[PDB]
Motif scaffolding. Sequence first.
Motif, PDB file in Angstrom:
ATOM      1  N   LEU D 134      33.856  -1.922 -23.144  1.00  0.00           N
ATOM      2  CA  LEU D 134      33.503  -2.989 -24.069  1.00  0.00           C
ATOM      3  C   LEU D 134      33.768  -2.522 -25.491  1.00  0.00           C
ATOM      4  CD1 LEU D 134      32.338  -5.800 -24.468  1.00  0.00           C
ATOM      5  CD2 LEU D 134      30.069  -4.778 -24.551  1.00  0.00           C
ATOM      6  N   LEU D 135      34.462  -3.347 -26.269  1.00  0.00           N
ATOM      7  CA  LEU D 135      34.865  -2.994 -27.622  1.00  0.00           C
ATOM      8  C   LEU D 135      34.284  -3.992 -28.610  1.00  0.00           C
ATOM      9  CD1 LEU D 135      38.441  -2.050 -26.616  1.00  0.00           C
ATOM     10  CD2 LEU D 135      37.065  -0.562 -28.079  1.00  0.00           C
ATOM     11  N   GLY D 136      33.698  -3.478 -29.687  1.00  0.00           N
ATOM     12  CA  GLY D 136      33.142  -4.298 -30.747  1.00  0.00           C
ATOM     13  C   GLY D 136      33.954  -4.136 -32.017  1.00  0.00           C
ATOM     14  N   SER D 137      33.763  -5.058 -32.954  1.00  0.00           N
ATOM     15  CA  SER D 137      34.545  -5.083 -34.178  1.00  0.00           C
ATOM     16  C   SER D 137      33.641  -5.216 -35.394  1.00  0.00           C
ATOM     17  CB  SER D 137      35.553  -6.236 -34.168  1.00  0.00           C
ATOM     18  OG  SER D 137      34.897  -7.480 -34.330  1.00  0.00           O
ATOM     19  N   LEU D 142      33.465  -9.365 -29.890  1.00  0.00           N
ATOM     20  CA  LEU D 142      33.418  -8.357 -28.839  1.00  0.00           C
ATOM     21  C   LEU D 142      34.459  -8.689 -27.784  1.00  0.00           C
ATOM     22  CD1 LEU D 142      30.332  -8.384 -30.002  1.00  0.00           C
ATOM     23  CD2 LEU D 142      29.808  -7.171 -27.881  1.00  0.00           C
ATOM     24  N   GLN D 143      35.148  -7.663 -27.295  1.00  0.00           N
ATOM     25  CA  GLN D 143      36.142  -7.832 -26.246  1.00  0.00           C
ATOM     26  C   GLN D 143      35.811  -6.909 -25.087  1.00  0.00           C
ATOM     27  OE1 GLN D 143      40.058  -7.237 -27.814  1.00  0.00           O
ATOM     28  NE2 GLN D 143      40.032  -9.104 -29.058  1.00  0.00           N
ATOM     29  N   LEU D 144      35.820  -7.459 -23.878  1.00  0.00           N
ATOM     30  CA  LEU D 144      35.671  -6.677 -22.660  1.00  0.00           C
ATOM     31  C   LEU D 144      37.052  -6.483 -22.054  1.00  0.00           C
ATOM     32  CD1 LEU D 144      33.933  -5.143 -20.842  1.00  0.00           C
ATOM     33  CD2 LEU D 144      33.136  -7.248 -19.756  1.00  0.00           C
ATOM     34  N   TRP D 145      37.346  -5.259 -21.629  1.00  0.00           N
ATOM     35  CA  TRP D 145      38.686  -4.908 -21.197  1.00  0.00           C
ATOM     36  C   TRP D 145      38.625  -4.169 -19.870  1.00  0.00           C
ATOM     37  CZ3 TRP D 145      43.847  -5.243 -22.900  1.00  0.00           C
ATOM     38  CH2 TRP D 145      44.032  -5.988 -24.070  1.00  0.00           C
ATOM     39  N   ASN D 146      39.760  -4.148 -19.179  1.00  0.00           N
ATOM     40  CA  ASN D 146      39.946  -3.329 -17.990  1.00  0.00           C
ATOM     41  C   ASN D 146      41.102  -2.375 -18.252  1.00  0.00           C
ATOM     42  OD1 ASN D 146      40.979  -2.491 -15.254  1.00  0.00           O
ATOM     43  ND2 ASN D 146      39.276  -3.776 -14.559  1.00  0.00           N
ATOM     44  N   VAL D 147      40.826  -1.074 -18.164  1.00  0.00           N
ATOM     45  CA  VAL D 147      41.846  -0.072 -18.455  1.00  0.00           C
ATOM     46  C   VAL D 147      42.959  -0.118 -17.414  1.00  0.00           C
ATOM     47  CG1 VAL D 147      42.215   2.338 -19.016  1.00  0.00           C
ATOM     48  CG2 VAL D 147      39.992   1.314 -19.447  1.00  0.00           C
ATOM     49  N   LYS D 148      42.594  -0.196 -16.130  1.00  0.00           N
ATOM     50  CA  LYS D 148      43.587  -0.106 -15.063  1.00  0.00           C
ATOM     51  C   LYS D 148      44.522  -1.311 -15.059  1.00  0.00           C
ATOM     52  CE  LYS D 148      45.437   1.701 -11.275  1.00  0.00           C
ATOM     53  NZ  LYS D 148      44.663   1.739 -10.002  1.00  0.00           N
ATOM     54  N   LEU D 153      39.542  -9.313 -20.150  1.00  0.00           N
ATOM     55  CA  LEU D 153      38.697 -10.093 -19.252  1.00  0.00           C
ATOM     56  C   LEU D 153      38.035 -11.254 -19.979  1.00  0.00           C
ATOM     57  CD1 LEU D 153      38.994  -7.339 -17.680  1.00  0.00           C
ATOM     58  CD2 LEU D 153      36.772  -7.852 -16.693  1.00  0.00           C
ATOM     59  N   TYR D 154      37.449 -10.987 -21.143  1.00  0.00           N
ATOM     60  CA  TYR D 154      36.659 -11.991 -21.836  1.00  0.00           C
ATOM     61  C   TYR D 154      36.499 -11.580 -23.290  1.00  0.00           C
ATOM     62  CZ  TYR D 154      32.894 -15.303 -22.841  1.00  0.00           C
ATOM     63  OH  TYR D 154      32.124 -16.308 -23.377  1.00  0.00           O
ATOM     64  N   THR D 155      36.270 -12.572 -24.146  1.00  0.00           N
ATOM     65  CA  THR D 155      36.046 -12.355 -25.567  1.00  0.00           C
ATOM     66  C   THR D 155      34.716 -12.980 -25.957  1.00  0.00           C
ATOM     67  OG1 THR D 155      38.364 -12.166 -26.233  1.00  0.00           O
ATOM     68  CG2 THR D 155      36.804 -12.980 -27.875  1.00  0.00           C
ATOM     69  N   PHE D 156      33.829 -12.173 -26.535  1.00  0.00           N
ATOM     70  CA  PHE D 156      32.527 -12.656 -26.970  1.00  0.00           C
ATOM     71  C   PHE D 156      32.621 -13.104 -28.416  1.00  0.00           C
ATOM     72  CE2 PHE D 156      30.182 -10.949 -23.322  1.00  0.00           C
ATOM     73  CZ  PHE D 156      31.067  -9.999 -22.863  1.00  0.00           C
ATOM     74  N   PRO D 157      32.283 -14.357 -28.736  1.00  0.00           N
ATOM     75  CA  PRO D 157      32.293 -14.775 -30.149  1.00  0.00           C
ATOM     76  C   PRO D 157      31.354 -13.959 -31.018  1.00  0.00           C
ATOM     77  CG  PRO D 157      31.173 -16.391 -28.770  1.00  0.00           C
ATOM     78  CD  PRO D 157      31.849 -15.439 -27.838  1.00  0.00           C
ATOM     79  N   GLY D 158      30.212 -13.547 -30.473  1.00  0.00           N
ATOM     80  CA  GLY D 158      29.327 -12.645 -31.188  1.00  0.00           C
ATOM     81  C   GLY D 158      28.704 -13.289 -32.408  1.00  0.00           C
TER      82      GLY D 158
END
Lengths: 7, 109, 76, 259, 50, 50, 178
Positions: D134-137, D142-148, D153-158
């Motif tokens: 999970l990456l924040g700015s 916020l962005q949730l990611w899959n490395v593999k 996956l999804y973007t959080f408006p936050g």
Amino acid sequence: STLPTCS
Amino acid sequence: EDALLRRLRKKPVWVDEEDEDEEMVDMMNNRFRKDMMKNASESKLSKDNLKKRLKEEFQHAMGGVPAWAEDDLLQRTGNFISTSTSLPRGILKMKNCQHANAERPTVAR
Amino acid sequence: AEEPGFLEGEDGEDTAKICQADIVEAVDIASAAKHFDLNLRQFGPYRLNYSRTGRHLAFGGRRGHVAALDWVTKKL
Amino acid sequence: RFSALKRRFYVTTCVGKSFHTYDVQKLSLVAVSNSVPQDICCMAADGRLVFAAYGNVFSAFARNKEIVHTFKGHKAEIHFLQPFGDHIISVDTDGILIIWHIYSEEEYLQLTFDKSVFKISAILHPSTYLNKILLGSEQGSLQLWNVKSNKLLYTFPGWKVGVTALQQAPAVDVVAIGLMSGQVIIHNIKFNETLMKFRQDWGPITSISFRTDGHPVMAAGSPCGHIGLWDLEDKKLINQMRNAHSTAIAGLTFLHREP
Amino acid sequence: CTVFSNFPVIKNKNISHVHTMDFSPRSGYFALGNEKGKALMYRLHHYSDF
Amino acid sequence: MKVKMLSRNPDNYVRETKLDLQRVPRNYDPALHPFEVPREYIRALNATKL
Amino acid sequence: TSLAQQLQRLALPQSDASLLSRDEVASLLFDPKEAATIDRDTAFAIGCTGLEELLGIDPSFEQFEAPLFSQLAKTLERSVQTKAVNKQLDENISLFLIHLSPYFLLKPAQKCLEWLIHRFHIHLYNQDSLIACVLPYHETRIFVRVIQLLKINNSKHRWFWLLPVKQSGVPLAKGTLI
RNA sequence: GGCCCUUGCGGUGCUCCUGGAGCGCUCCGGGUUGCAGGUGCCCGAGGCCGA
């Protein structure tokens, strides 16, 4: 984690 | 034990395809998962069996599930007591300063 | 009148990996009190002997500590 | 850092160009690391190894003393380190995120994020999640990611304040998010609901930790050096620790299953 | 009508005999003169003006 | 897992009153009472001496 | 002496000495020498009589007939059952003490408390609940007896400041409480 | 000399890294463990006394 070692 | 006790008394927004697909991952030869086996047949289990094994290891490590997991001045930080305009009683705040006749010293009354 | 204890895993669990912390939680308060860990590292390695009647325990330290105690109740 | 073969905790603190390791039982020194040419900027530990970053290159320390692996290839300073199994994630200042295999030192995968749109200020890998970070700015998204799979996956408006801290709550699907305004938001990432909100009027939330010894207690740091204890169960402030440190709080952590 | 309990610090032993006291017009300062030729002054932190 | 440990009820094994006498369970297991031949021989020899 | 401190800290109410011997018995109503010569049936009779007296005064006590004042409660001894059963018993005893608190000055309440002390040893397992029950009556002498039942000798104990009223047998003064 | 809710005055309860004396943990690796000759040790009380 379950990533492969190389590539 | 249970009999004695009785007498006394949505949908996830996102989905990951590789977690959906039914591939099987080796607990063997992987150091972090070798400590996590239960029986010898579980050398290599599938995705769904990985998920429930990982979650229960998390909850057992945490000691279970917290109860909280499933106008007012103490939902913010602040003060309560302040200074009054009138002179407070009991205790006087004082600091000694330089003598009034410091420049001109004398010994008489 | 009494019966011996027993310990079995379920759904293929292996009894080797079951730890003492899991047992203490699932056993009554009486037997749970019998598990304790005295930590005395200043003196040397210890040799312990239970009495023939299981009530008492005595131990001796390598550096010269000698003590005997009732271990059911925690009295020295 | 917990250790194998020794059922004890070790805490590692950076000291200039080296680092020191102390056992938490008695705060006794156990190892002093080798020097590096530049001052260490970021540090990480994964049980087996200790990772230290200086300038645009970061190295791995074995036995807490001597380096065994070095990783080059970044043109900017490293600001975040996240150990991911046998792989290590490094995030640069300009916006490059690269995953390295530790032992072979090869470059697994590289990603870039636009500095104006999405500048990474917090990194977190939630527990029990397979290959997910999970990456924040600073912007507040916020962005949730899959490395593999290498997909979003999804973007959080936050929230418009911007993320400054991320922490795993003692639950399968719950995270704690710090904000620059002094507000900590405890959120469920799977279904996107906010459980509770707490606000400290001391500036940005530097770090957050959770008590796991059976009491629902939360601590959040502040740059003034103060610590606030929030009751998770009753959604209230328990008490506040004033002047825990004279300077700004660097990092605070509850020991596992300990008061 | 209750006496402040902390003003005369008897341990210090500076005041000795007292003959005159006076207050500043805005009560900022408190002055006291003794027999030894020392005109003591104290400041009261509650009042911020001379 | 299913666990049980031997847990005696103290009220079964301890008398109730100062007036009462101590309770003595008996087990006739041969393993608990070894040396049955040499132990009885000494009692017989002591009987003749008495 | 480090072994002595470790053993003293390791002590627990479940492993109490008085559990395994009848030389001394804790009793709210009788001298220990006299209290060590009473059977379980007599204590059960006193407790049931007290509860029957209390039922006429207040009906809502009837719910305590089954869990705490029946044959199952007579045969029950806390040590052998698990922590879940002990927690349930603690909850039930706390509820019963909350209900007892208004009537504590009456004799039937003292009889019921005597039965609870004799059977469940709430003076060892439920110190907080008993203290909460008896606290608003700290000027009375029966409060002094209830304190005297406890063991608070250790200076690190939570209730150590209540030691004088145990040693001297006098009611707690309100100034000390404040 | 400085002290201003003070004292030429006193007391407590926790914390403060074993020289040998909490060893063994990056990676690699641990699998097929592949009847010479011994006999020890212990056993003394008498006062150029003090109270």
